């Protein structure tokens, strides 16, 4: 009744067991480039991301303007004082992210499916975000579901702690996951 695959080409995109993807479930624009929160004008000048609000800021537009991308921690002036991307939607709980556990073709109708293992944002755990959390941090739950591959939006990239900081230039779809979160026991375990 099912034919399982290690990998599947779906709509000219290769999906493989262990891949991480954005998902729009049945029961529930995608801009490449974000605006600077200061000038709102397109530019070749390098744009950095605030650790807190995740807004974009041209280096040359900061006060005082920066020449280089700051190494390590950085927040913008607004967080100092105290259309949406797919990542923005995920982190606001308006779409899902999952790791691909299985892929198969349903024999009865030829439809392709995955077994999704859901990620969860800290806000959606009953105890919520903690001070030590990062804004791009996800937990990998022990919740699973059968989802049609048609419901997959596109890949995201979920990094273990050892590889997260080195992915600082890898774009908007990069997330951190260190822990498995059991939703029933409300407990954490290292993926490591």
């Amino acid at each position: 009744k099912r034919v399982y695959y290690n990998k599947v080409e779906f709509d000219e995109t290769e999906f493989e067991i262990g891949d991480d993807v954005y998902v729009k479930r049945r029961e529930d624009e995608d801009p490449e480039i974000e605006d600077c929160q200061i000038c709102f004008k397109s530019d070749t000048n390098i744009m950095i991301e605030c650790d807190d609000c995740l807004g974009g800021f041209h280096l040359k537009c900061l006060k005082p303007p920066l020449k280089e991308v700051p190494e390590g921690d950085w927040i913008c002036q607004f967080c100092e004082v105290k259309a949406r991307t797919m990542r923005e939607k995920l982190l606001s709980g308006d779409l899902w992210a999952a790791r691909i556990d299985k892929l198969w073709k349903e024999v009865d109708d030829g439809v392709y499916w995955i077994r999704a293992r859901w990620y969860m944002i800290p806000e959606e755990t009953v105890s919520g975000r903690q001070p030590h959390n990062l804004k791009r941090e996800l937990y990998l739950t022990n919740d699973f579901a059968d989802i049609e591959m048609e419901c997959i939006l596109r890949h995201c990239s979920v990094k273990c702690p050892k590889e997260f900081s080195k992915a600082s230039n890898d774009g908007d779809d990069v997330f951190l996951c260190e822990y498995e979160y059991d939703v029933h026991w409300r407990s954490f375990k290292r993926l490591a």
Binding site: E32, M47, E49, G56, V69, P70, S157, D170, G171, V174
Partner: peptide
């Protein structure tokens, strides 16, 4: 600090 992309991966 992370950078903002100029194009999708």
């Amino acid at each position: 600090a992370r950078t903002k992309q100029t194009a999708r991966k």
